[PDB]
Amino acid sequence: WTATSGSCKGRCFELQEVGPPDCRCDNLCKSYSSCCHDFDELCLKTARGWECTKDRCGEVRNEENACHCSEDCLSRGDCCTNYQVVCKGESHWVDDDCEEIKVPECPAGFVRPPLIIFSVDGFRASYMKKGSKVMPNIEKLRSCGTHAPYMRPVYPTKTFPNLYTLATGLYPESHGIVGNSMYDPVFDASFHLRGREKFNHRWWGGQPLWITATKQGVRAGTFFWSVSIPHERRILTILQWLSLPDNERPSVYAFYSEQPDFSGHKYGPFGPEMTNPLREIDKTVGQLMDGLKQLRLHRCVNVIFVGDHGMEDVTCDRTEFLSNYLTNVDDITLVPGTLGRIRAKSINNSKYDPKTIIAALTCKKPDQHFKPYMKQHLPKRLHYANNRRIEDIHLLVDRRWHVARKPLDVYKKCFFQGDHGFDNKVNSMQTVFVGYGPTFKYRTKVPPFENIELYNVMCDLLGLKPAPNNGTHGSLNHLLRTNTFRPTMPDEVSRPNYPGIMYLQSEFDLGCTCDDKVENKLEELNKRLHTKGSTKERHLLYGRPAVLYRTSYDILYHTDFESGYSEIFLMPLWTSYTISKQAEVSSIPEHLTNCVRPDVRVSPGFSQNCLAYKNDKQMSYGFLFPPYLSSSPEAKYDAFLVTNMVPMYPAFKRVWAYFQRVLVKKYASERNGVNVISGPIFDYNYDGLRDTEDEIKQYVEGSSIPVPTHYYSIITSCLDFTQPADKCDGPLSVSSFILPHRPDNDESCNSSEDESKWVEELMKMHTARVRDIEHLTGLDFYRKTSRSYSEILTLKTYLHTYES
Ligand SMILES: *[C@@H]1O[C@H](CO)[C@@H](O[C@@H]2O[C@H](CO)[C@@H](O[C@@H]3O[C@H](CO[C@H]4O[C@H](CO)[C@@H](O)[C@H](O[C@H]5O[C@H](CO)[C@@H](O)[C@H](O)[C@@H]5O[C@H]5O[C@H](CO)[C@@H](O)[C@H](O)[C@@H]5O)[C@@H]4O)[C@@H](O)[C@H](O[C@H]4O[C@H](CO)[C@@H](O)[C@H](O)[C@@H]4O[C@H]4O[C@H](CO)[C@@H](O)[C@H](O)[C@@H]4O)[C@@H]3O)[C@H](O)[C@H]2NC(C)=O)[C@H](O)[C@H]1NC(C)=O
Ligand SMILES: O=C1c2cnc(N[C@@H]3Cc4ccc(Cl)cc4C3)nc2CN1C1COC1
Ligand SMILES: [Ca+2]
Ligand SMILES: [Ca+2]
Ligand SMILES: [Cl-]
Ligand code: NA
Ligand code: NA
Ligand SMILES: [Zn+2]
């Protein structure tokens, strides 16, 4: 109930929301059906439109007018945005030469540069180039300010997930808005775009920027606008708030446009009908910038132009139907479209089996336009699993396609020509970032980055301490002229042991054998120097990783590689090796095929054993440093040490062997040498974070050898590939992956073919940021470079995407 009998007299777009049953006059009252009777009359004036004309200049103030051209309007803070242009012979902001803003130029009483976020729905990255002719205001922001060629959204590339990620710095799995549509089984409640449940506070986790601001005594404008409030009125409301007295005036504001998404859905991303939407957004930006210029704030305010996601070509004819795969289609609920989420229709149906559904949806049709996953098997880069609102069964849908349950769902609902929601590495899903103002750099291009990073920066721009989030604070310092955040490197928690030779061969009863009984003062001292780390400078280029948790581990040095060996997990946390452009691949000799060798530096009781692998009929083993890249026949024996061995399913060993035999050398050839750090990952609770030992659900049978969920590699080289990896003077280049350790290759529909036709495709799907691996391992990499720390943070957030 609302008592709509109150009045918005003097309360229009009030910042403090009053509570029921008192009637509301804020920019959301409409969305709750709660506005006072007179809100439209007083607050949504339209008379005479949005522009001054010659004839209105110096008019008698008529309070019925939507905006004013009277002499008192600047002082009232309610001129039309073009008032000074039409009436005072000023120029439009866009017509002004762009001049560097070295310092804030703010009116008296402004404590800090205000931040205005100009957010645009469905604004595809390539619109900045392809639409440049019809977007002069936006192109001046872009060219004179700081811009990225694109910004990467989060998965799924839907509106509420991405806007709330922008607001919080969190992955959707953490903030709780994991889709446009959701069922929470704990609440027994459904979130939808239509209706009132979505307003319930229990859906919305984390702490959005407007709350972070308020709590730290920075006042905020309200970020959400009721759909019926026209854009011109949104802009005028913002400009009015900026004329409030200092004690009352917000420091942070958001504008939102439903365009170009709205038209994009109807016409497709590049439909001829898309030009006018882009012109209209640009005019709105023009209005803002002209309005700021009038208020003398155009060289004071920091303005962010940012999108939530892009737009792809999608038609009703490109729909896959689960009814063409499942017999049992009526026993499931599907969340459909550009992703699929599947659960049981009834929790009383005990005949529901996810295993049988996945199998019926796996590599069934030659050109199949979706791939089923258990959510914990999704690429770790998507960070899309650790929430009860994310169904166990997920369908990754190919770009340009939809999935639906049955055909009748499509036509008893072609209409639409665009959609979004796909994998966030897809080029069509990428969106835009521009920053303009005193705190941003001048005419600066920055590399693409992820929208999870922005919250931190908005906090920096406002002098706020960010709530804990999934950004890496300092990774975007290169966007900023001032207000940079200068972090220290985390302190190492666990110092390594450096074991010498402590055990005789006969002390080991591992059930391993090696044909290595083959016998020199010249070379005898040489191998001693290798085991004490005489080659470690070559193989450990950026310092040893720091272990950021309490554990017991040993540094082991070798001719060709160095490792940090966990006495707890009985395997390396990391193995580091450098492969030059000139390096030769060799085979595993016939006589050494099944060779495993005790490591006389490590006690039997902290070693793996071969008998456990013999008895475990499902589990085999591989090596972290590859025997194929041994520098000499004698050095190759090091590669068969029990301390280099890790558990691997035979199916995964196909993937691993091809990576180690073919791809590493390929990358060294292409990149002028590479440094590789490989190791295991344990994430059995799919939270993106390093497991403790008590969270491991699977061991090699009859043993305490824990089974990794994933294997990682970090592959670093010189950005200037005219320098070799091991003698790089300048910035680095990295690519990484986190490969799921699976007992089958069902994910790869062409896996019965040669590894040359599918393995590298798998690895590209499982591309990762170094930062992803840090979370999953509790390691901190790149501790000892000649690079600034902020630059290294940027490197650690880089994702190699493999798009054109
Ligand atoms: C991305 O960044 C985020 C933010 O930094 C990272 O997420 C954090 O990770 C931490 C570890 O997983 C986690 O810390 C825990 O906090 C528990 C209390 O959490 C509440 O309080 C915070 C602060 O206000 C709040 O933000 C939380 O919000 C979550 O939950 C609500 C609803 O419940 C949602 O509205 C919201 O979206 C959010 O959901 C997400 O997080 C939860 C986890 O809390 C997930 O389950 C969801 O799926 C979703 O992802 C909470 O309201 C605290 O209780 C924990 O302490 C336990 O563990 C320690 C271990 O030492 C132990 O000593 C304690 O005893 C305790 O265990 C006890 O409870 C166990 C389980 O009930 C039980 O088994 C034991 O026997 C014990 O009784 C812990 O400290 C933090 O909550 C989140 N924060 C957020 C915002 O998500 C995230 O990791 C980053 N991602 C990556 C990849 O890096
Ligand atoms: O009706 C609306 C609506 C209204 N206002 C908004 N404001 C945006 C929320 C937000 C968050 C972070 C940042 Cl940095 C800027 C902004 C501004 N957003 C929306 C989204 N939406 C529906 C269309 O898809 C859901
Ligand atoms: Ca959107
Ligand atoms: Ca974990
Ligand atoms: Cl969804
Ligand atoms: Na075996
Ligand atoms: Na297969
Ligand atoms: Zn949309």
Side-chain angles (χ1 to χ4, degrees), residues 1-412 414-518 520-804:
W1 180 270
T2 297
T4 67
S5 61
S7 169
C8 287
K9 180 173 137 53
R11 302 171 50 203
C12 281
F13 294 106
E14 70 189 353
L15 290 169
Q16 298 168 36
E17 175 191 335
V18 297
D22 314 336
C23 66
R24 280 165 69 174
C25 307
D26 61 277
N27 62 345
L28 269 178
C29 66
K30 285 279 195 198
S31 290
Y32 293 72
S33 282
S34 57
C35 306
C36 300
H37 73 276
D38 54 9
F39 178 88
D40 284 329
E41 183 191 357
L42 300 184
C43 306
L44 294 180
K45 291 177 172 152
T46 51
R48 303 208 68 189
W50 308 114
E51 291 176 28
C52 290
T53 48
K54 279 163 177 159
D55 66 283
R56 285 189 65 177
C57 297
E59 68 194 355
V60 187
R61 168 161 288 263
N62 185 341
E63 297 279 23
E64 281 178 0
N65 288 333
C67 55
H68 302 285
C69 313
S70 37
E71 198 55 39
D72 68 351
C73 76
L74 279 172
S75 50
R76 288 285 302 273
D78 61 5
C79 310
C80 306
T81 60
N82 72 338
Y83 165 75
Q84 291 211 124
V85 175
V86 170
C87 300
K88 291 284 172 283
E90 259 287 15
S91 52
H92 287 289
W93 174 80
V94 63
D95 293 308
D96 300 330
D97 289 350
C98 108
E99 304 286 348
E100 188 174 2
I101 315 166
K102 302 198 181 161
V103 297
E105 306 171 21
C106 295
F110 281 77
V111 69
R112 74 181 70 71
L115 170 66
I116 301 171
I117 304 149
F118 195 109
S119 76
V120 281
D121 185 17
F123 201 108
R124 178 169 175 167
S126 57
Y127 286 163
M128 288 298 248
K129 178 135 295 113
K130 297 171 72 68
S132 64
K133 261 67 150 56
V134 307
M135 297 189 305
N137 284 275
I138 292 169
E139 296 303 336
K140 180 184 175 180
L141 284 178
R142 188 201 57 78
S143 57
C144 289
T146 301
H147 84 280
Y150 57 91
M151 184 178 71
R152 187 174 308 116
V154 291
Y155 187 78
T157 56
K158 293 299 200 189
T159 301
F160 273 139
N162 276 280
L163 288 175
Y164 204 56
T165 285
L166 282 172
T168 58
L170 294 166
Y171 298 121
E173 72 175 7
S174 287
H175 69 50
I177 315 300
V178 304
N180 275 341
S181 173
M182 303 179 279
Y183 175 67
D184 187 316
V186 162
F187 299 163
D188 180 41
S190 295
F191 179 103
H192 321 279
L193 292 159
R194 292 278 170 206
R196 304 195 63 85
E197 188 43 46
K198 73 172 189 283
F199 294 116
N200 200 309
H201 274 226
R202 65 191 178 172
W203 294 105
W204 308 87
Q207 181 187 95
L209 179 64
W210 54 90
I211 293 304
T212 302
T214 291
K215 284 202 187 286
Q216 295 175 45
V218 176
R219 205 170 307 98
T222 54
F223 277 40
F224 295 90
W225 296 93
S226 296
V227 74
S228 55
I229 300 164
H231 292 193
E232 296 89 344
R233 174 58 61 201
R234 301 183 192 177
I235 295 307
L236 282 176
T237 301
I238 288 173
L239 291 174
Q240 191 74 76
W241 285 333
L242 277 163
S243 296
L244 282 163
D246 304 328
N247 75 276
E248 290 177 62
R249 181 180 56 242
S251 285
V252 65
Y253 302 85
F255 171 84
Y256 175 78
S257 164
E258 301 80 8
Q259 289 287 42
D261 178 87
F262 179 74
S263 295
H265 277 292
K266 282 172 94 309
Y267 300 125
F270 304 111
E273 304 88 340
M274 292 305 296
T275 290
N276 279 345
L278 291 181
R279 294 191 182 297
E280 283 313 287
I281 296 156
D282 196 76
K283 170 171 203 187
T284 302
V285 172
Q287 286 183 352
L288 177 61
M289 293 317 289
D290 282 350
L292 292 177
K293 189 180 171 188
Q294 286 200 151
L295 296 188
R296 304 187 288 107
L297 286 169
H298 64 302
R299 294 176 62 77
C300 174
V301 168
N302 292 298
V303 177
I304 292 171
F305 187 87
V306 61
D308 54 1
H309 53 70
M311 190 72 61
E312 178 63 273
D313 288 294
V314 185
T315 56
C316 306
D317 62 322
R318 290 194 297 264
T319 307
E320 294 258 13
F321 296 107
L322 298 194
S323 54
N324 297 336
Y325 293 81
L326 306 182
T327 72
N328 60 271
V329 91
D330 293 324
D331 286 344
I332 69 155
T333 301
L334 172 68
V335 182
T338 54
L339 47 148
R341 316 205 296 279
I342 291 165
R343 57 182 196 287
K345 178 139 188 157
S346 173
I347 51 100
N348 299 133
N349 173 34
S350 44
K351 242 108 283 143
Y352 182 81
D353 191 7
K355 282 149 179 273
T356 60
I357 292 163
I358 291 289
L361 296 172
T362 294
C363 308
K364 275 298 127 69
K365 308 274 154 57
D367 290 332
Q368 186 173 316
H369 302 280
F370 70 89
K371 188 181 297 302
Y373 289 85
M374 295 309 292
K375 61 173 183 176
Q376 70 274 10
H377 292 156
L378 285 165
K380 298 298 271 178
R381 63 187 172 72
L382 298 180
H383 295 284
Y384 196 72
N386 191 204
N387 196 292
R388 64 186 186 217
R389 302 169 188 172
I390 304 168
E391 287 81 0
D392 286 350
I393 299 170
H394 201 77
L395 310 181
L396 271 187
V397 177
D398 291 2
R399 69 188 81 190
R400 297 171 48 85
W401 284 76
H402 279 164
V403 67
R405 202 174 62 91
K406 301 200 302 189
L408 74 80
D409 294 335
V410 167
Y411 62 76
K412 300 282 258 204
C414 180
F415 327 110
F416 63 77
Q417 297 188 265
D419 211 357
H420 56 88
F422 304 107
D423 187 340
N424 63 326
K425 77 180 180 75
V426 171
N427 271 346
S428 63
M429 294 302 95
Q430 305 311 297
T431 188
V432 295
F433 175 76
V434 178
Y436 181 94
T439 316
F440 286 111
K441 292 188 178 193
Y442 174 66
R443 301 197 173 266
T444 293
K445 181 177 190 160
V446 304
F449 65 90
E450 298 188 336
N451 69 346
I452 59 164
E453 299 301 334
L454 254 197
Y455 169 79
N456 282 339
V457 167
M458 294 186 293
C459 286
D460 291 343
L461 290 174
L462 291 168
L464 303 173
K465 172 172 189 169
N469 70 90
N470 304 127
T472 301
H473 201 174
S475 84
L476 291 189
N477 279 343
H478 62 284
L479 277 65
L480 299 176
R481 178 184 300 271
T482 61
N483 300 13
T484 60
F485 174 87
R486 291 299 177 192
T488 71
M489 285 187 180
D491 291 329
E492 174 147 43
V493 168
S494 288
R495 82 177 148 274
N497 309 292
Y498 298 88
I501 303 183
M502 293 158 58
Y503 301 93
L504 297 176
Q505 168 89 34
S506 63
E507 296 186 67
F508 294 88
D509 186 16
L510 306 185
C512 302
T513 68
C514 188
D515 186 34
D516 63 344
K517 308 299 175 197
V518 182
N520 188 20
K521 265 184 179 163
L522 300 167
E523 303 183 49
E524 240 185 53
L525 185 56
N526 227 8
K527 61 191 241 220
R528 288 175 221 170
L529 299 177
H530 292 333
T531 304
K532 317 243 203 189
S534 76
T535 62
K536 78 185 154 178
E537 314 312 331
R538 177 94 201 304
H539 297 304
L540 196 76
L541 285 181
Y542 323 104
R544 74 172 165 70
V547 172
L548 306 192
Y549 63 94
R550 177 71 288 181
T551 200
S552 187
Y553 83 101
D554 304 315
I555 302 299
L556 308 178
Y557 300 116
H558 319 79
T559 310
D560 294 342
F561 69 101
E562 180 180 334
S563 61
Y565 176 85
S566 178
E567 288 189 347
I568 306 314
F569 282 77
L570 303 177
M571 63 186 69
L573 298 183
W574 59 262
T575 300
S576 184
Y577 61 101
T578 300
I579 306 299
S580 74
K581 176 157 194 185
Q582 291 79 46
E584 195 132 65
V585 169
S586 52
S587 66
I588 294 170
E590 288 177 46
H591 80 283
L592 291 180
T593 299
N594 297 310
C595 166
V596 182
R597 302 167 71 243
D599 189 339
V600 293
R601 301 165 296 193
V602 181
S603 75
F606 296 128
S607 300
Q608 292 177 42
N609 71 101
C610 286
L611 183 60
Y613 289 102
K614 181 183 203 295
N615 294 330
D616 196 319
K617 289 309 187 267
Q618 322 307 317
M619 192 57 64
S620 187
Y621 66 84
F623 296 104
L624 286 180
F625 172 82
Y628 320 100
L629 291 166
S630 68
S631 57
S632 73
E634 187 187 309
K636 194 187 293 283
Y637 286 93
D638 297 350
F640 298 112
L641 288 169
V642 67
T643 48
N644 187 40
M645 190 172 50
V646 291
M648 296 193 169
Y649 291 117
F652 188 74
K653 278 171 70 189
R654 293 191 60 204
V655 171
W656 195 251
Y658 184 80
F659 162 63
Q660 292 193 318
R661 186 174 57 82
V662 178
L663 296 180
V664 170
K665 193 42 227 160
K666 189 178 88 178
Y667 304 148
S669 261
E670 284 176 357
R671 292 173 59 173
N672 189 5
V674 289
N675 177 259
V676 183
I677 308 176
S678 297
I681 280 161
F682 306 85
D683 196 21
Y684 276 95
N685 61 354
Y686 49 86
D687 73 340
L689 306 177
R690 178 197 54 94
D691 286 358
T692 57
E693 332 165 38
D694 64 4
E695 285 174 334
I696 306 309
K697 293 191 202 195
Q698 199 199 330
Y699 294 84
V700 185
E701 178 193 311
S703 83
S704 289
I705 311 160
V707 176
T709 56
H710 300 82
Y711 286 100
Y712 75 85
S713 295
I714 305 176
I715 310 172
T716 314
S717 63
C718 206
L719 183 65
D720 178 13
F721 46 80
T722 77
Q723 304 196 320
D726 70 338
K727 306 184 194 75
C728 182
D729 293 329
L732 308 175
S733 168
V734 67
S735 60
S736 313
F737 62 73
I738 302 167
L739 277 170
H741 179 219
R742 287 180 62 188
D744 66 67
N745 285 303
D746 289 351
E747 182 174 5
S748 306
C749 291
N750 300 320
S751 62
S752 73
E753 297 178 29
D754 189 66
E755 284 85 5
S756 67
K757 302 294 169 183
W758 63 268
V759 164
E760 205 183 2
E761 177 190 334
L762 175 71
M763 286 168 53
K764 292 179 181 178
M765 186 59 33
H766 290 281
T767 191
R769 310 174 307 145
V770 170
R771 204 73 187 86
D772 291 328
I773 296 166
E774 290 188 335
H775 293 312
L776 282 164
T777 60
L779 302 169
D780 193 62
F781 298 100
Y782 301 125
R783 311 267 302 164
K784 305 297 209 160
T785 73
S786 60
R787 309 312 307 170
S788 89
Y789 184 43
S790 276
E791 181 183 309
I792 290 303
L793 289 177
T794 307
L795 187 66
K796 286 181 177 191
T797 63
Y798 175 82
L799 186 72
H800 200 65
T801 43
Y802 300 98
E803 291 288 300
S804 69

